[PDB]
Amino acid sequence: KTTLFCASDAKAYEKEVHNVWATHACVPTDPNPQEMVLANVTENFNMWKNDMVEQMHEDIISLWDESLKPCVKLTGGSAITQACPKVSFDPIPLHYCAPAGFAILKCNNKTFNGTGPCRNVSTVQCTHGIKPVVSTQLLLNGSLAEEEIIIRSENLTNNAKTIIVHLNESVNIVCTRPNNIRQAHCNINESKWNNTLQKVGEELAKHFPSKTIKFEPSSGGDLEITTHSFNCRGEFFYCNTSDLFNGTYRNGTYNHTGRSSNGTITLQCKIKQIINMWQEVGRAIYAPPIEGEITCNSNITGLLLLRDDTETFRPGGGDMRDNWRSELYKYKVVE
């Protein structure tokens, strides 16, 4: 363990806050990317015990609190007020790099579940570009598995450990508050969701070989975790997923029990101003939403699940360290 440094293609002239942060905190990425393969050198990784995840977590916390200043911040009996202007918000890729005297080993097994021994390992200076996308239930704008869908979890038998589902084909999702000012909706093409969830059921059945797979909405908790919550153009979208995680996989076939209309699922959402923070235990209070068409067209690249005759799976999340682990799993900082 050392202190790693970030590398970004951010531009000192753009007023978008990811660029503003990265110019002030990261070095320019090098087009000197020397990757060195070692086929008979073999190393052990644990994506769930990886200090790079905590370093990136600290970095993104700093980013958000220097870039999404809430009008009010309520923590531990104290309140903190500051200017809370609307900003230009669109995440950019970030690379994480070992300093001199250190390397980063990268597992080239296309089917690696993030834990155990990898036989094909390569050394690099920096990770690939990672967008610090804060979200729950669905992992957005990530990178896709190269072969089959991969299931990752610290302990599959423990029902309290988060399950990361790494997809191999993206599912487009278009969320929009169009031109009540806090009502918005997401559109998802239900046939891609159908095929995606059946193949996900296939892999989940491989880890549970009876065992009829069930997808049901989030049980309970804070609105941030019981909905697909994310930030788009600076606004905090909370999107109902009752019609999304709602189906059954049995006897090798998937049937979607959530309601859809002419072939698309639409999630109902509110843009909220009181936010249960993910950075720490507390609440953040922002101004009402901007004027105009607020839309993000994103790619679903992964899922965050929690497991309850059968096994039921519900969308999870809330600890965005899992969001970072979904991209940092191939890596291991070495001396």
Ligand X SMILES: CNCc1ccc2c(c1)[C@@H](CC[C@@H](O)CO)[C@H](CNC(=N)N)[C@H]2NC(=O)C(=O)Nc1ccc(Cl)c(F)c1
Ligand Y SMILES: *[C@@H]1O[C@H](CO)[C@@H](O)[C@H](O)[C@H]1NC(C)=O
Residues forming contacts to ligand X in the complex (CB under 6 A) are 134-136, 222, 224-225, 229-231, 236, 275-278, 281-282, 318-319, 321
Output the smallest distance, CB 283 to ligand X, in A: 7
Nearer to ligand X, 188 or 306 (CB): 306
Whose structure tokens read 């799976």? 313
- Under the binding rule (CB under 6 A), the answer on residue 219 touching ligand Y is no
Nearer to ligand Y, 73 or 214 (CB): 214
Site for ligand Y in 163-182 (CB under 6 A): 168-169
Contact of residue 213 among ligand Y, ligand X, none (CB under 5-8 Å per partner type): none
Length of the chain: 335
Give the chain's end-to-end CA distance (angstroms, integer): 8
The DSSP secondary structure of 270-305, one letter per residue, reads: EEESEEE-SSSSSEEE-PPPPSS-EEEEEEEEEEEE
Contact of residue 224 among ligand X, ligand Y, none (CB under 5-8 Å per partner type): ligand X
CB 276 within 8 A of CB 224: yes
Among the residue ranges 7-15, 50-58, 67-75, 293-301, the one whose residues contact ligand Y (CB under 6 A) = 293-301
Output the smallest distance, CB 147 to ligand Y, in A: 6
CB 65 within 8 A of CB 17: no
CB 282 within 8 A of CB 269: no
Output the smallest distance, CB 189 to ligand Y, in A: 7
Phi, psi of 214 (to 5 degrees): -130, 135
- Under the binding rule (CB under 6 A), the answer on residue 156 touching ligand Y is yes
Closest residue to ligand X, Cβ-based?
318
Cα separation values, 248 from 43, 205, 261, 303, 304, Å: 38, 12, 19, 17, 17
Residues 6+ apart with CB under 8 A from 177: 183, 184, 235, 237, 269, 271, 289, 293, 294, 295
What residues are paired with 43 via a beta bridge? 118
For residue 96, which of 326, 328, 323 has the smallest C-alpha distance? 328
Strand 103-107 versus strand 331-334 pairing type: antiparallel
Output the smallest distance, CB 226 to ligand X, in A: 10
- Under the binding rule (CB under 6 A), the answer on residue 296 touching ligand Y is yes
Nearer to ligand Y, 61 or 223 (CB): 223
For residue 55, which of 329, 321, 330 has the smallest C-alpha distance? 321
Of 100, 101, 263, 291, the one binding ligand Y (CB under 6 A) is 263
Contact of residue 277 among ligand X, ligand Y, none (CB under 5-8 Å per partner type): ligand X
Cα separation values, 188 from 120, 140, 214, Å: 37, 13, 20
CB 104 within 8 A of CB 124: yes
Nearer to ligand X, 169 or 319 (CB): 319
Contact of residue 232 among ligand X, ligand Y, none (CB under 5-8 Å per partner type): ligand Y
Which SS3 state, helix, strand or coil, does residue 89 take? coil
Which SS3 state, helix, strand or coil, does residue 236 take? strand
Draw the binding track, 62-101, toward ligand Y (x: CB under 6 A; -: no contact).
-----------------------------x----------
Of 8, 20, 190, 244, the one binding ligand Y (CB under 6 A) is 190
Contact of residue 319 among ligand X, ligand Y, none (CB under 5-8 Å per partner type): ligand X
Could you list the residues that contact ligand Y (CB under 6 A)?
91, 113, 115-117, 133, 140-141, 147-149, 151, 153, 155-158, 168-169, 190-191, 194, 199, 202-203, 216-217, 223, 226-227, 230, 232, 240, 242-243, 246, 254-259, 263, 296-298
